[PDB]
Amino acid sequence: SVFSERTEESSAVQYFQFYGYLSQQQNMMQDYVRTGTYQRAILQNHTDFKDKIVLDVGCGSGILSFFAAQAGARKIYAVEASTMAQHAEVLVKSNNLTDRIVVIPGKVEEVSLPEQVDIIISEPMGYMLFNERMLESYLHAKKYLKPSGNMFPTIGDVHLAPFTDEQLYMEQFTKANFWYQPSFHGVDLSALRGAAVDEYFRQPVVDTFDIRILMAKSVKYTVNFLEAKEGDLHRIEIPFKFHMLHSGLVHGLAFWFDVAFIGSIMTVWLSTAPTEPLTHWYQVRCLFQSPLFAKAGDTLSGTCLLIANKRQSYDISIVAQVDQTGSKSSNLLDLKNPFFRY
Amino acid sequence: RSVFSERTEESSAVQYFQFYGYLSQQQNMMQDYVRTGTYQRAILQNHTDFKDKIVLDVGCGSGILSFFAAQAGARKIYAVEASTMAQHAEVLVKSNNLTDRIVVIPGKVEEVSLPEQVDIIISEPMGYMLFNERMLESYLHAKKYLKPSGNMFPTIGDVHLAPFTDEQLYMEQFTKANFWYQPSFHGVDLSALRGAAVDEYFRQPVVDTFDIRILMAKSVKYTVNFLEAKEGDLHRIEIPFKFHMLHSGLVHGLAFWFDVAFIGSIMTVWLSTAPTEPLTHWYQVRCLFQSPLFAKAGDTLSGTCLLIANKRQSYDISIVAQVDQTGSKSSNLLDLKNPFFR
Amino acid sequence: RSVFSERTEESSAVQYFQFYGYLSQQQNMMQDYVRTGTYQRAILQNHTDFKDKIVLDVGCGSGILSFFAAQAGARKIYAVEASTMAQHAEVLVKSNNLTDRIVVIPGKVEEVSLPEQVDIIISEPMGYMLFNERMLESYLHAKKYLKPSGNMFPTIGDVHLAPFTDEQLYMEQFTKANFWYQPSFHGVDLSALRGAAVDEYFRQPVVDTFDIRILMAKSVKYTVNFLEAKEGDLHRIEIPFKFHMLHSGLVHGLAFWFDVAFIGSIMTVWLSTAPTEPLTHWYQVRCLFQSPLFAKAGDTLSGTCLLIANKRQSYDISIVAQVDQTGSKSSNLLDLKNPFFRY
Amino acid sequence: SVFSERTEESSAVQYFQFYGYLSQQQNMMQDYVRTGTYQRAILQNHTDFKDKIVLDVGCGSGILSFFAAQAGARKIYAVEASTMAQHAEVLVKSNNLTDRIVVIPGKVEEVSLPEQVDIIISEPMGYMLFNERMLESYLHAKKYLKPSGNMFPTIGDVHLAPFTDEQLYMEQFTKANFWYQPSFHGVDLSALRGAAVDEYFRQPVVDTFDIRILMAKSVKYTVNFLEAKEGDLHRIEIPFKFHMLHSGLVHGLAFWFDVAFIGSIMTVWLSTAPTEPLTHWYQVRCLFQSPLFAKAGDTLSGTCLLIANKRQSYDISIVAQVDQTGSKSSNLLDLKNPFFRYT
Ligand SMILES: NC(=[NH2+])NC/C=C/[C@H]1O[C@@H](n2cnc3c(N)ncnc32)[C@H](O)[C@@H]1O
Ligand SMILES: NC(=[NH2+])NC/C=C/[C@H]1O[C@@H](n2cnc3c(N)ncnc32)[C@H](O)[C@@H]1O
Ligand SMILES: NC(=[NH2+])NC/C=C/[C@H]1O[C@@H](n2cnc3c(N)ncnc32)[C@H](O)[C@@H]1O
Ligand SMILES: NC(=[NH2+])NC/C=C/[C@H]1O[C@@H](n2cnc3c(N)ncnc32)[C@H](O)[C@@H]1O
């Protein structure tokens, strides 16, 4: 299958084992912003669901399928690959919706669905929007979508902005310098200090932060899920030119994302921005190997290149330059193994 | 086909050795001064057991125990390590000018070849609750390389079990599970899954420390003699217990910790993770009952802790305990692989 | 075949009036100084409403309110009381030399025969949550004796309710029910009764006081006008509510208190059992949801509190609450007759 | 029936409503001395149960029936008059014992049993042993007992002893002196002081105490359940001669009880004495209206007469005199309404 060809078995096993836990479902459900916004987008756009056929991709415990039922869908196909599909079935039964919701256990790339649907709903977003590569499964499912169908979410915007955080930058070295001693219990560890530094720097930092560390308005990269093909997510080249609003040292790029549900009655936004209430997605920061000085009014130009890998994630390649000075830096990070700093 | 691969799912092995490839993890273990300081003391205080001897270090990591063996005068130390850390260990060997005494052998101890038999084996095979990671079997397996009258550091492992009271912890885990009692979460009835939730939430061993005054009886000791034990002895571990209750009250579960002894020629050195001792990175482990038991002082609490090794490098744990005088009985199942760090 | 006996189980009445035959209970009520002092202020500051008037004291107990009416100048006071406390009332009337003004008439106000119509009715008909004991219906029934131009003290009653958060209270009640989850209590599996236990423990309204900071919205007010209301109006009491949540968090239930006003000719005197006021022997009352509701500040919490009168001189309470934006809904049935005294 | 003939309906309705609560079952079950001693008595005398027919009188949630089953009984008829019988039935089913335990809802004086039984088990003891008058129901059940039959408990011993407790005595007047004031909000209450005193003294005091307040070795009155008849419990006369071990003022009599399960293997005792761990029965004290001075070596003689009433309890009459001085005191108390003093 398309899933198998693009995913290492070892990664897939652990991934779906992780989502087999009710505790992870509770963590997602207890995010009020997430759950409430999904509910609001579906119910306030009830004409997009009433008497429609719906496909729910990666339904987990089934919550979005229930919301689609509340809005009056005629039939909902709920697809889930983890063992959570068992529990979703229990809820479908216990909520007396077996006549309207059918749970299909398996990967959406592999299951057989009988008919074309009117709308696909899903929560495919990971860290930095793209982590887990579930957006590809979501787009792959469009093989079941009628030509005039819709997607909830309809678009996703990843946002990038330069930040200054001297303490975050220094912290890497404080930790790595553990290795810089000539006699740790009689052992000279200093030869590994460089390796330790590199290792810390390859890890995106998952946590939140004061918006006052941001030095420029974000750059936006938009994926239109109604137009995109799944192949469009294998390589994501995000050019940027930031107009510096503040003068200082730039230590890296901060990432967050929004998605929009564009229905017939209204458009509803779900944002993970640092200006908004915190979510279980937090935000993500990637450090440069060296900070860049930029005056207010300078331009910081470069690219963020995301290269998908077989571990259901991305390698992040970042290059940045201060145009007015020519000062340049970069980093290459592994999104599969972020550092949870929060 | 090897002993390791036959008892281990590839998926589990991949993530396991990936985890131990990280220098940040080596640092976390090394910075446990109780652990590191006690190992050095055990080896240097028993320098005669190493002086001009051939040594095997099982799962050497960055090699710190090999370096202790070298300080103690070992003629030759074979340092076996299956993760990519083995290459970092070789870098330290070279930078400490010990190429003449420490020889890194990359790979699994169940699969590599050694040129000769050794006089003593050293390792840190202890995981959480002693047995997690199933490294003790690799440790015992390496005895195929041990000369008939060879030694092992550590020489023995003591598992301690004792009943505890902690209503706060118990209701902490009950509060989490009650989420799945909701009859209308955003209009959805979750109550059918309440049973599954409690089961899942109570399968988690609780990792943290506690005040010794929560213990309700003197501990029971289960000893593993690593000189005598065979690998197969650890596939199914049945630990009987009979506690003489010292205080009346609710027993919410069993607390676990372990000691290991290094029985050398000069002296015996103990490494303890007991709640009476300085805290280590192993902390202590508590297994909750789904329903507490009441016992009065002078009563006896009897039963079995059953550990079945699984193919995920861990154990499925079965605890059954009853108050002998009343027949009040509790029985819980735990997944040692996935604890709750508190 | 009186109105009282028609709406009341004999077993309930016997115990009810036996309870109120105890002097120790009269002492408890009288020693509530907010209560006794406010009643005296309402009556004496409005003395013109009593001076040379005919008074009916409904459920007079030891007679304290009748003595206040006599202090205010009442020409004649009929003090009706159905418990054996009527006899102690008579003793106090004689020892206080008020035999020419206070006339104890033993019996139920629904069954006695009064010699004439009265200018004003006085009583303390309020139980826990205001409505417990169904004494308000006896109070209203007594209006058959009230002149058209007549007054009632208290004149109106305001029920207040507001959502609260209190995880510790919620946890206390579940810790109690956890007992019936045991799969082997002395070798017996109890767990089949765990549902029944939770229902029973959460049926208990909680009587005690609390910090006003646990309240998550402005209270809603339900007003009963005693001059206007009819007995039949209290058989089914439906209180709709819509709260504008001022704080985010889990709502564990609704808190209840009441105010009564004495609307006299000279001034209105208020007696409040609100948690912002000095504690009374009424305290405050909290009804727990079996499952808490989450709401954010700005959301609205709407639903109904429905009280259905029963033949044990109390009400069967049903509360349904729903977060309007999410449809998160919770309900509970409470037995007002038998509260949990937590104080 | 025999039950309805000796019990007022109003009392019976409240009584069985009370025992309908799972919270009350939980309360009794959590008394470990109580629950544990019954289990011990039954299990350690397994030969009185193994393959036998059993009747459990007032089984409540059914716990004693399950112990009889654990001891190997062939068949247990469990009789319970409250709605708790519905919960017992649930437990029998969920515990897979429907083949061995038959729940029979109803009063034991009114149900029919299909066969005679080898042994009757019950927990009929109330405060001061006799409160609730369930011992009569227990004795009544002997119409179903075979001539060899045994009874668990087999005998009941009521103990009584004189005590001194100056502070408990003075407490009564401290409370009653509320009424001794000439202007409570303008009202002279003093005429009711005597009635208030009398009311406090008619209440037996339920709590525990230090054994050092006892002034003499207890006197024991024994009910043998194998021999006693129902009628024997309608009038209980307990004579006493106390030989005073200490000099001081005697403020009343203290009561507690033991029961023995006299089985074929051994006799097990359940005691509520102040020398033993506390139970939910506590101990009971009945004050004298006036204390009696006795010297060490003096004799305190008199009678404790218990007279059954139709409220499922007893009127208590105690008369005592000091033989060497002729000094005399008495009291009349109402066991149905004790003062719970324990803190
Ligand atoms: N936080 C998040 N929302 N993370 C992403 C959400 C992942 C959810 O979707 C499921 N899922 C992921 N890929 C799938 C596929 N190919 N077919 C079917 N179900 C799939 C996961 O098991 C989980 O329940
Ligand atoms: N807390 C701890 N001390 N945990 C255990 C420590 C295990 C260490 O030994 C290595 N290891 C585990 N199993 C092995 C095997 N079969 N052959 C070779 N190396 C192995 C791990 O990669 C890690 O460095
Ligand atoms: N705490 C309180 N204020 N409780 C309410 C007040 C109850 C008082 O009024 C009496 N009472 C109740 N219903 C009555 C009726 N139908 N006729 C005559 N007297 C009656 C009670 O015996 C008690 O003295
Ligand atoms: N703490 C205690 N041991 N209290 C006494 C125990 C009383 C128990 O016996 C029941 N009971 C009382 N009289 C009964 C009768 N005549 N027939 C059947 N069941 C009856 C009560 O409902 C309660 O469950």
Swiss-Prot record, chain B:
GO terms for molecular function: histone H3R17 methyltransferase activity; histone H3R2 methyltransferase activity; histone H3R26 methyltransferase activity; histone methyltransferase activity; protein methyltransferase activity; protein-arginine N-methyltransferase activity; protein-arginine omega-N asymmetric methyltransferase activity; transcription cis-regulatory region binding. Keywords: Chromatin regulator, Chromosome, Cytoplasm, Isopeptide bond, Methylation, Methyltransferase, Nucleus, Phosphoprotein, S-adenosyl-L-methionine, Transcription, Transcription regulation, Transferase, Ubl conjugation. It comes from the Eukaryota. One of its GO terms (biological process) is positive regulation of fat cell differentiation. Methylates (mono- and asymmetric dimethylation) the guanidino nitrogens of arginyl residues in several proteins involved in DNA packaging, transcription regulation, pre-mRNA splicing, and mRNA stability. Recruited to promoters upon gene activation together with histone acetyltransferases from EP300/P300 and p160 families, methylates histone H3 at 'Arg-17' (H3R17me), forming mainly asymmetric dimethylarginine (H3R17me2a), leading to activation of transcription via chromatin remodeling. Belongs to the class I-like SAM-binding methyltransferase superfamily. Protein arginine N-methyltransferase family. Homodimer. Interacts with NR1H4. Interacts with SNRPC. Interacts with the C-terminus of NCOA2/GRIP1, NCO3/ACTR and NCOA1/SRC1. Part of a complex consisting of CARM1, EP300/P300 and NCOA2/GRIP1. Interacts with FLII, TP53, myogenic factor MEF2, EP300/P300, TRIM24, CREBBP and CTNNB1. Interacts with RELA. Identified in a complex containing CARM1, TRIM24 and NCOA2/GRIP1. Interacts with NCOA3/SRC3. Interacts with SKP2. Interacts (via PH domain-like fold) with C9orf72. Interacts with PARP1; promoting PARP1 recruimtent to replication forks. This is Histone-arginine methyltransferase CARM1. The lineage of its organism: Eukaryota, Metazoa, Chordata, Craniata, Vertebrata.
Curated annotation (Swiss-Prot), chain C:
The keyword Cell membrane does not apply. Residues 13-320 form the SAM-dependent MTase PRMT-type domain. Disruption phenotype: Neonatal lethality. The lungs of neonates do not inflate and they do not breathe. The same neonate lethality is observed with mutants that produce CARM1 protein without enzyme activity. Embryos are distinctly smaller at 18.5 dpc. They show reduced lipid accumulation in brown adipose tissue and reduced amounts of brown adipose tissue. Thymocyte differentiation is blocked at an early stage. Mutants display complete loss of protein methylation of the CARM1 substrates PABPC1 and EP300/P300. Keywords: Chromatin regulator, Chromosome, Cytoplasm, Isopeptide bond, Methylation, Methyltransferase, Nucleus, Phosphoprotein, S-adenosyl-L-methionine, Transcription, Transcription regulation, Transferase, Ubl conjugation. One of its GO terms (biological process) is estrogen receptor signaling pathway. Methylation of H3R17 (H3R17me) by CARM1 is stimulated by preacetylation of H3 'Lys-18' (H3K18ac) H3 'Lys-23' (H3K23ac) by EP300 and blocked by citrullination of H3 'Arg-17' (H3R17ci) by PADI4. It is found in: Nucleus; Cytoplasm; Chromosome. Ubiquitously expressed. Within the brain, present in proliferating cells from lateral ventricular zone and dentate gyrus (at protein level). It is an enzyme of class 2 (transferase). Residues 213-246 are annotated as: Required for nuclear translocation. Its EC number is 2.1.1.319. The modification Phosphoserine is found at residue 83. GO terms for cellular component: cytosol; nuclear replication fork; nucleus; protein-containing complex; RNA polymerase II transcription regulator complex. S-adenosyl-L-methionine binds at residues 26, 35, 59, 81, 110, 138. Changing residue 39 to A: Reduces protein methyltransferase activity. There is a cross-link at residue 94 (Glycyl lysine isopeptide (Lys-Gly) (interchain with G-Cter in ubiquitin)). One of its GO terms (molecular function) is protein methyltransferase activity. Disulfide bonds: none annotated. Changing residue 83 to A: Loss of S-adenosyl-L-methionine binding. Loss of protein methyltransferase activity. Localized in the nucleus. Phosphorylation at Ser-83 is strongly increased during mitosis, and decreases rapidly to a very low, basal level after entry into the G1 phase of the cell cycle. Phosphorylation at Ser-83 interferes with S-adenosyl-L-methionine binding and strongly reduces methyltransferase activity. Phosphorylation at Ser-83 may promote cytosolic location. It catalyses: L-arginyl-[protein] + 2 S-adenosyl-L-methionine = N(omega),N(omega)-dimethyl-L-arginyl-[protein] + 2 S-adenosyl-L-homocysteine + 2 H(+). Belongs to the class I-like SAM-binding methyltransferase superfamily. Protein arginine N-methyltransferase family. This is Histone-arginine methyltransferase CARM1. It comes from Mus musculus (Mouse). The gene is Carm1.
